[PDB]
Amino acid sequence: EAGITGTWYNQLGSTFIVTAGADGALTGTYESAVGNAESRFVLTGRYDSAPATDGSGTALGWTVAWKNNYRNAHSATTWSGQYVGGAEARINTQWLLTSGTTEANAWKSTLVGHDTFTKVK
Amino acid sequence: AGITGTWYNQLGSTFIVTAGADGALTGTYESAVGNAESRFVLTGRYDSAPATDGSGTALGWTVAWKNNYRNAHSATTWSGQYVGGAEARINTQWLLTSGTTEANAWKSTLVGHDTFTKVKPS
Amino acid sequence: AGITGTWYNQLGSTFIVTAGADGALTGTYESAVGNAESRFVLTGRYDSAPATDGSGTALGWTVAWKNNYRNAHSATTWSGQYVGGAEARINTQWLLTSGTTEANAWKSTLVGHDTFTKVKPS
Amino acid sequence: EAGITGTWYNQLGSTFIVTAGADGALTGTYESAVGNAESRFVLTGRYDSAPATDGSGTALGWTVAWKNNYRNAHSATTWSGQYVGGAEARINTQWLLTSGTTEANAWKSTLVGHDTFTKVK
Ligand SMILES: O=C(O)CCCC[C@H]1[C@H]2NC(=O)N[C@H]2C[S@@]1=O
Ligand SMILES: O=C(O)CCCC[C@H]1[C@H]2NC(=O)N[C@H]2C[S@@]1=O
Ligand SMILES: O=C(O)CCCC[C@H]1[C@H]2NC(=O)N[C@H]2C[S@@]1=O
Ligand SMILES: O=C(O)CCCC[C@H]1[C@H]2NC(=O)N[C@H]2C[S@@]1=O
């Protein structure tokens, strides 16, 4: 899917390189400008490969576990959102960042936020 | 013992997953509710070297709700942690985004929480 | 029977509330966890004329975590529904925002879920 | 609290009129540009009345139950966020909109989003 496939940046300055496969797969790498992260992390996700054509966005999501060969934050983020195509393509998301915690600290395990991605073009 | 296996949440949904050695999650999801029938592909990631202090194992995965039977034009992500032991559990929060027009984007995303165990419902 | 009363969540926190006839919630909250001691003021709102089809009663409330003992420079909102019957329940999701610099705003907000009943813990 | 007290608008065109009391109270009215809503609804909430002075925002939250003398959507929204003062004051929030549902439909009871409010000045 040519629309989604490419390089994207968000408002924090983070980098999202993704390829959208014909089967609904998302694969790529993520580099965060913030947090307990350095270098590229694997991402995987899914997207609606046959979206509505009535002006609606294309639903998608992906996950990064924050372990690579250089860093392990013991955490994972999922982004859930929609791709909005056109000449000024955007991916608008909300996300959940869960850190591994003890059971007593589980109440404070999950951060929530929102990222807007702009396609480099 | 481990993430790999067949899990069920409080709604009776079935989450079948394999955890690869280096952090991949791959499997299928069947929801007991919503605009869904049969199994859907899921992929995700988990921390393949968790802390050794009693902490849970962070993980997440995604389902896009399109298969041979239906297309809900939506996707859910689950973010959470696996907690091992005698009754292993995955505790999650989730975000279900539907494709919308820009005008309706404000009402595009449902949020909830699912807890999974390996105990089959009756 | 009703929203008015003393409630306890799964953490052992104590939520004491009065539901006014026209939709006000007023009371106190004591958290079993976090940067908190003793009771904090809370205020909120509820649907004072719910649907008559078996649906729950929508409600929400806020605590700012400042009292005579501490100030965590944070606030939590709970959004959910009251479900009456033999074991009345309030099921919520919550957002805990801490005051941060603009640079740290990305990590300002925790999310979770609390379920309340009138059963005192032991 | 002069900072928070005033009229605010968000990116949807909704209107938030609030008064911040010395005791940490927020009181006012909300008018939504969208959804099952018409006219003004009561809001109540709380804010940190003695915030940090190290450059941090002021934590706050409020609730609207979507019943007034003209409309009842059988729902309630809470906004949780922070006030960022200065000449271009903002209230940056995330929100949870819970609708009353049957028990079988409770899984789909709650919407999540984010609103940014600008002070009318
Ligand atoms: O601190 C960690 O646990 C790992 C890094 C998390 C970075 C977060 C931050 N970076 C970003 O591009 N968007 C937000 C949501 S991602 O969880
Ligand atoms: O209706 C749809 O858009 C597709 C099905 C969504 C089912 C949801 C529901 N099922 C489940 O096991 N947990 C929750 C979160 S999943 O988004
Ligand atoms: O640490 C703080 O900032 C203040 C205390 C927060 C306690 C939280 C925790 N306690 C509870 O009963 N439910 C959850 C959500 S409330 O934000
Ligand atoms: O549809 C309803 O149930 C009542 C109206 C909800 C309006 C929502 C929408 N309007 C707004 O200014 N911000 C968002 C979050 S508020 O729940």
XYZ file of C-alpha atoms and ligand atoms in Angstrom:
554
model
C 0.000 0.000 0.000
C 1.793 3.035 -1.366
C -0.089 5.458 0.884
C 1.129 4.140 4.213
C 4.525 2.846 3.055
C 7.281 5.378 3.684
C 9.006 7.502 6.274
C 7.020 9.491 8.805
C 7.885 11.897 11.633
C 5.792 12.970 14.658
C 5.552 16.127 16.708
C 8.282 14.972 19.102
C 10.738 14.456 16.234
C 10.451 10.633 16.353
C 10.938 8.570 13.101
C 8.606 5.796 11.801
C 9.738 3.803 8.696
C 7.051 1.370 7.570
C 6.125 -0.930 4.740
C 2.463 -1.877 4.231
C 2.076 -5.358 2.728
C -0.733 -6.554 0.443
C -1.935 -8.887 3.213
C -2.519 -6.108 5.779
C 0.935 -6.342 7.414
C 2.888 -3.380 8.747
C 6.615 -3.890 9.277
C 9.379 -1.389 9.947
C 11.416 0.463 12.516
C 10.771 3.206 15.040
C 13.189 5.718 16.569
C 11.910 7.772 19.496
C 13.094 11.303 20.164
C 12.240 10.848 23.864
C 12.302 8.382 26.669
C 14.328 5.353 27.544
C 15.181 4.593 23.941
C 18.142 4.821 21.586
C 18.430 3.829 17.942
C 15.937 1.812 15.903
C 13.382 -0.631 17.298
C 11.394 -3.224 15.417
C 7.741 -2.536 14.851
C 4.966 -4.754 13.590
C 1.297 -4.072 13.053
C -1.765 -4.383 10.870
C -3.896 -2.117 8.683
C -7.228 -2.349 6.833
C -6.090 -3.329 3.323
C -9.541 -2.713 1.778
C -10.743 0.500 3.409
C -13.923 2.386 2.753
C -13.775 4.825 -0.146
C -16.363 7.225 1.227
C -13.853 9.729 2.618
C -12.980 7.728 5.717
C -9.474 7.124 7.059
C -7.769 3.726 6.963
C -7.636 2.065 10.390
C -4.272 0.737 11.542
C -2.138 -0.048 14.560
C 1.362 -1.110 15.490
C 3.517 -2.131 18.426
C 7.085 -1.428 19.502
C 8.627 -3.400 22.389
C 11.435 -1.134 23.622
C 14.206 -3.736 23.409
C 16.840 -3.686 20.722
C 20.454 -4.794 20.667
C 21.442 -1.534 22.432
C 18.751 -0.834 25.042
C 15.927 -2.465 26.989
C 13.363 -0.178 28.675
C 11.150 -3.140 29.706
C 8.129 -1.549 28.077
C 5.972 -1.620 24.954
C 3.912 0.997 23.110
C 0.938 0.425 20.870
C -0.351 3.105 18.498
C -3.955 2.857 17.296
C -5.175 5.278 14.652
C -6.012 6.066 11.096
C -4.196 7.013 7.929
C -5.628 10.005 6.111
C -4.349 10.105 2.540
C -3.918 12.823 -0.054
C -1.121 15.241 -0.832
C -0.665 16.026 2.884
C -0.851 12.505 4.273
C -1.189 12.030 8.050
C -1.407 9.165 10.514
C -3.374 10.307 13.557
C -2.935 8.082 16.605
C -3.523 7.499 20.258
C -1.058 5.307 22.103
C -0.610 3.193 25.246
C 2.856 2.722 26.734
C 2.911 -0.151 29.264
C 5.979 -0.696 31.404
C 6.672 -3.990 33.128
C 5.967 -3.485 36.820
C 5.578 -5.438 40.027
C 1.987 -6.336 40.862
C 1.855 -3.633 43.572
C 2.874 -1.007 40.964
C 0.635 -2.217 38.141
C -1.837 0.629 38.720
C 0.804 3.033 37.380
C 2.074 0.844 34.529
C 0.437 2.566 31.544
C 0.882 6.011 29.984
C -1.513 7.344 27.348
C -0.951 9.985 24.696
C -1.437 11.001 21.088
C 0.971 11.354 18.170
C 0.386 12.885 14.734
C 2.642 11.622 11.959
C 3.507 13.530 8.785
C 4.825 11.707 5.734
C 8.219 12.710 4.427
C 7.666 13.315 0.737
C 4.402 -21.821 31.034
C 4.876 -18.686 28.910
C 3.167 -16.228 26.575
C 2.821 -18.853 23.821
C -0.558 -20.522 24.028
C -4.308 -20.091 23.872
C -5.779 -17.327 26.002
C -9.328 -16.179 26.765
C -10.537 -12.824 28.050
C -13.493 -11.822 30.204
C -15.741 -11.492 27.110
C -14.906 -15.058 25.985
C -12.691 -13.933 23.095
C -9.913 -16.342 22.034
C -6.310 -15.120 21.591
C -3.940 -17.733 20.138
C -0.348 -16.571 20.065
C 3.231 -17.679 19.532
C 6.024 -15.717 21.185
C 9.207 -15.818 19.144
C 12.546 -15.937 20.916
C 13.559 -12.410 19.900
C 10.316 -10.570 20.665
C 7.766 -11.328 17.936
C 4.112 -12.093 18.687
C 2.161 -13.790 15.901
C -1.255 -15.408 16.025
C -4.984 -15.062 15.676
C -7.806 -13.371 17.528
C -11.487 -14.291 17.624
C -13.755 -11.749 19.308
C -16.885 -12.806 21.175
C -18.358 -9.344 20.506
C -18.641 -6.659 17.864
C -18.469 -6.631 14.095
C -16.351 -9.743 13.880
C -16.647 -13.400 12.958
C -14.029 -16.156 13.041
C -10.298 -15.529 13.345
C -8.314 -12.428 12.460
C -4.578 -12.107 12.013
C -2.622 -10.412 14.780
C 0.985 -9.386 15.179
C 2.815 -7.692 18.020
C 5.957 -7.506 20.137
C 7.001 -8.388 23.676
C 10.047 -7.824 25.896
C 12.106 -10.977 25.311
C 14.398 -10.264 28.274
C 12.237 -8.972 31.135
C 13.589 -7.570 34.382
C 14.499 -10.098 37.051
C 12.908 -8.255 39.966
C 9.403 -9.765 39.810
C 8.169 -7.340 37.162
C 5.781 -8.366 34.436
C 6.686 -8.707 30.762
C 5.591 -5.768 28.617
C 3.836 -6.562 25.342
C 1.364 -5.337 22.748
C -0.397 -6.479 19.626
C -2.726 -5.322 16.864
C -5.700 -6.725 15.017
C -7.098 -5.080 11.877
C -10.706 -6.270 11.712
C -10.680 -7.553 8.118
C -10.834 -11.250 7.236
C -12.687 -13.422 4.677
C -16.018 -12.921 6.454
C -16.167 -9.215 7.298
C -14.406 -5.891 7.297
C -15.272 -3.591 10.184
C -12.861 -0.903 8.897
C -11.248 -0.730 12.316
C -8.201 -1.867 14.272
C -7.549 -2.635 17.932
C -4.280 -2.473 19.794
C -3.777 -4.124 23.191
C -0.965 -2.846 25.424
C -0.161 -4.614 28.663
C 1.929 -7.061 30.602
C 2.206 -10.797 31.066
C 2.406 -11.983 34.656
C 3.540 -15.581 35.049
C 2.914 -18.058 37.846
C 0.288 -20.659 38.691
C -2.498 -18.832 36.899
C -0.659 -16.872 34.240
C -2.369 -13.657 33.185
C -2.092 -10.949 30.544
C -3.530 -7.645 31.721
C -4.193 -5.129 28.968
C -5.723 -1.842 28.015
C -6.861 -1.408 24.432
C -7.662 1.216 21.794
C -10.158 0.400 19.032
C -9.933 2.965 16.209
C -12.484 2.990 13.427
C -11.869 4.676 10.081
C -13.873 7.894 10.107
C -14.219 11.127 8.234
C -12.177 13.978 9.669
C -15.364 15.517 11.093
C -16.101 12.323 13.081
C -12.542 11.680 14.164
C -13.415 12.883 17.649
C -15.550 9.719 18.104
C -13.205 7.308 16.303
C -11.554 5.588 19.281
C -12.966 3.315 21.970
C -10.887 2.440 25.032
C -11.193 -0.531 27.370
C -9.381 -3.217 29.289
C -9.164 -6.968 28.819
C -7.653 -9.564 31.159
C -6.616 -12.890 29.667
C -5.947 -16.310 31.222
C -5.439 -19.765 29.758
C -8.624 -21.044 31.419
C -11.228 -21.994 28.802
C -14.687 -20.585 29.542
C -17.634 -22.857 30.300
C -29.546 1.574 46.951
C -27.984 4.307 44.794
C -24.776 6.167 43.978
C -24.739 7.902 47.381
C -22.617 5.949 49.816
C -19.185 4.602 50.640
C -17.420 2.685 47.893
C -14.140 0.762 47.696
C -12.092 -0.176 44.647
C -9.806 -3.108 43.901
C -6.799 -1.251 45.400
C -8.665 -0.657 48.692
C -9.199 3.062 48.049
C -12.259 4.660 49.702
C -14.688 6.820 47.676
C -17.365 8.549 49.774
C -19.923 10.366 47.674
C -23.282 12.107 47.745
C -25.351 12.233 44.568
C -27.486 15.351 44.409
C -30.932 15.163 42.861
C -30.005 17.227 39.797
C -26.696 15.576 38.894
C -24.000 16.756 41.317
C -21.430 14.397 42.844
C -19.622 15.681 45.931
C -17.421 13.797 48.362
C -13.984 12.612 49.324
C -11.430 10.147 48.037
C -8.702 8.323 49.942
C -6.213 6.417 47.794
C -4.555 3.233 49.022
C -1.637 3.931 46.655
C 0.541 6.710 45.311
C 1.561 10.115 46.575
C -1.489 10.541 48.750
C -2.490 10.462 52.397
C -5.909 10.910 53.999
C -8.926 12.340 52.194
C -9.047 14.606 49.164
C -11.967 16.637 47.894
C -13.774 15.371 44.813
C -16.547 16.750 42.660
C -18.269 15.366 39.594
C -21.524 14.855 37.713
C -23.871 11.984 36.913
C -26.916 11.422 34.691
C -29.819 12.140 37.053
C -32.386 10.637 34.666
C -30.874 7.475 33.170
C -32.435 5.471 30.362
C -35.092 2.965 31.366
C -33.852 0.111 29.189
C -31.445 -1.541 31.651
C -28.560 0.787 30.831
C -26.116 1.976 33.438
C -25.907 5.528 34.769
C -23.080 7.580 33.273
C -20.910 9.567 35.678
C -17.490 11.077 36.276
C -15.508 12.854 38.935
C -12.186 14.557 39.610
C -9.669 14.644 42.417
C -6.822 17.175 42.511
C -4.188 15.555 44.725
C -3.649 18.470 47.129
C -4.799 18.407 50.754
C -3.345 19.432 54.150
C -0.833 16.569 54.096
C 0.592 16.540 50.570
C 0.484 17.979 47.096
C 1.305 15.549 44.303
C 0.769 18.264 41.649
C -1.584 15.958 39.786
C -5.264 15.272 39.159
C -7.265 12.154 38.335
C -10.560 11.917 36.528
C -12.724 8.781 36.623
C -15.274 8.259 33.838
C -17.695 5.366 34.000
C -21.103 4.018 34.831
C -23.051 2.939 37.879
C -24.819 -0.396 37.588
C -27.420 -1.022 40.276
C -28.782 -4.274 41.661
C -27.891 -6.670 44.461
C -24.194 -5.874 44.339
C -24.127 -2.342 42.991
C -20.993 -1.453 41.052
C -19.283 1.563 39.516
C -17.027 0.614 36.621
C -14.561 3.295 35.582
C -11.582 4.185 33.488
C -9.329 6.961 34.728
C -6.735 9.505 33.596
C -4.099 10.724 36.064
C -2.348 13.850 34.735
C 0.693 15.240 36.484
C 1.902 18.807 35.998
C 4.956 18.618 33.762
C 7.184 20.805 31.680
C 6.198 20.994 28.026
C 9.130 18.723 27.137
C 7.809 15.987 29.476
C 4.167 16.390 28.568
C 4.350 13.199 26.533
C 4.705 11.237 29.819
C 2.242 13.304 31.870
C -0.803 11.007 31.822
C -1.376 7.563 33.305
C -4.457 5.549 32.351
C -6.160 2.732 34.236
C -9.424 1.234 35.369
C -11.041 0.953 38.782
C -14.139 -1.024 39.779
C -15.964 0.030 42.928
C -18.449 -1.780 45.189
C -19.885 -1.001 48.605
C -18.210 -4.073 50.119
C -15.584 -3.056 52.687
C -12.263 -4.865 52.239
C -10.933 -7.250 54.879
C -7.112 31.709 40.077
C -6.951 34.306 37.334
C -5.015 32.038 34.970
C -7.629 29.333 34.576
C -10.718 31.510 35.090
C -12.202 32.644 31.786
C -13.578 31.528 28.461
C -11.821 28.878 26.413
C -12.416 27.249 23.017
C -11.104 23.924 21.635
C -10.202 22.677 18.191
C -13.753 21.468 17.523
C -15.189 24.922 18.247
C -16.585 23.894 21.668
C -16.872 26.537 24.497
C -15.646 26.121 28.123
C -16.498 28.920 30.640
C -14.880 28.275 34.013
C -14.187 29.901 37.335
C -11.301 28.613 39.474
C -11.972 29.046 43.201
C -9.374 29.633 45.930
C -10.177 26.192 47.373
C -9.296 24.266 44.186
C -12.846 24.224 42.751
C -13.679 24.489 39.064
C -17.240 25.479 38.183
C -18.756 26.574 34.890
C -20.505 25.550 31.716
C -19.575 23.627 28.594
C -21.055 23.821 25.091
C -19.996 21.130 22.628
C -19.730 21.780 18.911
C -20.324 18.059 18.257
C -22.273 15.091 19.417
C -25.544 14.532 21.159
C -25.487 17.912 22.851
C -27.199 21.283 22.580
C -26.746 24.413 24.665
C -24.839 24.742 27.935
C -24.110 21.925 30.378
C -22.924 22.205 33.946
C -19.341 21.316 34.659
C -17.515 20.797 37.916
C -13.930 19.874 38.630
C -10.776 20.450 40.619
C -7.333 21.962 40.050
C -4.018 22.147 41.934
C -4.326 25.519 43.700
C -0.646 25.562 44.762
C 1.230 24.292 41.714
C 4.940 23.933 41.257
C 6.726 27.067 40.090
C 9.524 25.271 38.275
C 8.005 25.624 34.801
C 5.470 22.834 35.196
C 1.810 22.995 34.178
C -1.044 23.081 36.690
C -2.906 19.762 36.896
C -6.690 19.880 36.628
C -9.767 17.946 35.594
C -13.488 18.371 35.127
C -16.658 16.471 34.324
C -19.740 17.167 32.227
C -22.770 14.851 32.468
C -24.595 15.418 29.168
C -27.989 16.223 30.692
C -29.395 19.712 30.797
C -32.931 21.046 30.688
C -32.947 20.587 26.878
C -31.154 17.299 26.157
C -30.023 14.052 27.770
C -27.389 11.966 25.936
C -27.058 9.505 28.862
C -23.310 10.009 28.963
C -20.541 11.845 30.798
C -17.117 13.158 29.775
C -14.131 13.766 31.988
C -11.177 15.882 30.861
C -7.834 15.378 32.611
C -4.964 17.708 31.788
C -2.829 20.662 32.615
C -3.012 24.419 32.349
C 0.025 26.052 30.793
C 0.069 29.763 31.584
C 1.637 32.805 29.975
C 0.501 35.175 27.260
C -0.698 32.250 25.105
C -2.443 30.206 27.776
C -3.511 26.630 26.956
C -5.283 23.760 28.675
C -4.056 20.488 27.187
C -6.299 17.513 27.932
C -7.161 13.919 27.327
C -10.752 12.865 27.851
C -12.986 9.834 28.462
C -16.601 9.877 27.286
C -18.630 7.064 28.905
C -22.135 6.348 27.685
C -24.639 4.425 29.767
C -24.956 0.975 28.223
C -26.426 -2.430 28.926
C -23.991 -4.864 30.522
C -23.574 -6.744 27.212
C -22.542 -3.462 25.508
C -20.273 -2.165 28.267
C -17.143 -3.116 26.306
C -17.979 -0.319 23.852
C -19.110 2.272 26.410
C -16.073 4.582 26.453
C -14.529 6.869 23.830
C -11.116 8.471 24.325
C -9.674 11.604 22.764
C -7.727 14.798 23.301
C -8.741 18.460 23.289
C -6.545 21.570 23.339
C -8.153 24.702 24.751
C -7.117 28.268 23.931
C -8.074 31.132 26.222
C -10.152 33.923 24.762
C -8.295 37.075 25.710
O 10.500 5.275 27.720
C 10.228 4.156 27.237
O 9.739 3.246 27.961
C 10.515 3.873 25.779
C 10.326 5.045 24.837
C 8.858 5.493 24.782
C 8.658 6.650 23.788
C 7.198 7.108 23.663
C 7.039 8.480 22.990
N 7.856 8.614 21.803
C 7.054 8.765 20.776
O 7.521 8.946 19.526
N 5.770 8.794 21.050
C 5.598 8.546 22.471
C 4.896 7.222 22.766
S 6.208 5.981 22.777
O 5.775 5.110 23.896
O -16.494 -4.116 16.111
C -15.357 -4.061 15.635
O -14.933 -2.963 15.133
C -14.447 -5.244 15.585
C -14.478 -6.120 16.839
C -13.947 -5.357 18.055
C -13.948 -6.239 19.311
C -13.322 -5.567 20.549
C -13.628 -6.270 21.861
N -13.446 -7.705 21.782
C -12.513 -8.072 22.647
O -12.094 -9.344 22.820
N -12.001 -7.064 23.330
C -12.601 -5.823 22.897
C -11.616 -4.881 22.217
S -11.592 -5.400 20.487
O -11.465 -4.089 19.861
O 0.312 9.693 43.032
C -0.490 10.602 42.804
O -0.237 11.454 41.884
C -1.749 10.780 43.588
C -2.475 9.476 43.925
C -2.980 8.785 42.656
C -3.735 7.491 42.987
C -4.367 6.802 41.762
C -4.803 5.367 42.010
N -5.537 5.212 43.249
C -6.753 4.764 42.979
O -7.698 4.519 43.912
N -6.976 4.587 41.689
C -5.810 4.978 40.932
C -6.047 6.190 40.039
S -5.756 7.618 41.107
O -5.121 8.500 40.133
O -22.360 12.753 22.338
C -22.450 12.830 23.582
O -22.636 11.795 24.277
C -22.368 14.179 24.262
C -21.425 15.177 23.621
C -19.966 14.703 23.695
C -19.004 15.740 23.088
C -17.526 15.334 23.176
C -16.609 16.149 22.252
N -16.887 17.568 22.306
C -15.824 18.170 22.784
O -15.763 19.507 22.926
N -14.798 17.395 23.054
C -15.190 16.016 22.820
C -15.237 15.182 24.099
S -16.882 15.463 24.789
O -17.222 14.110 25.292
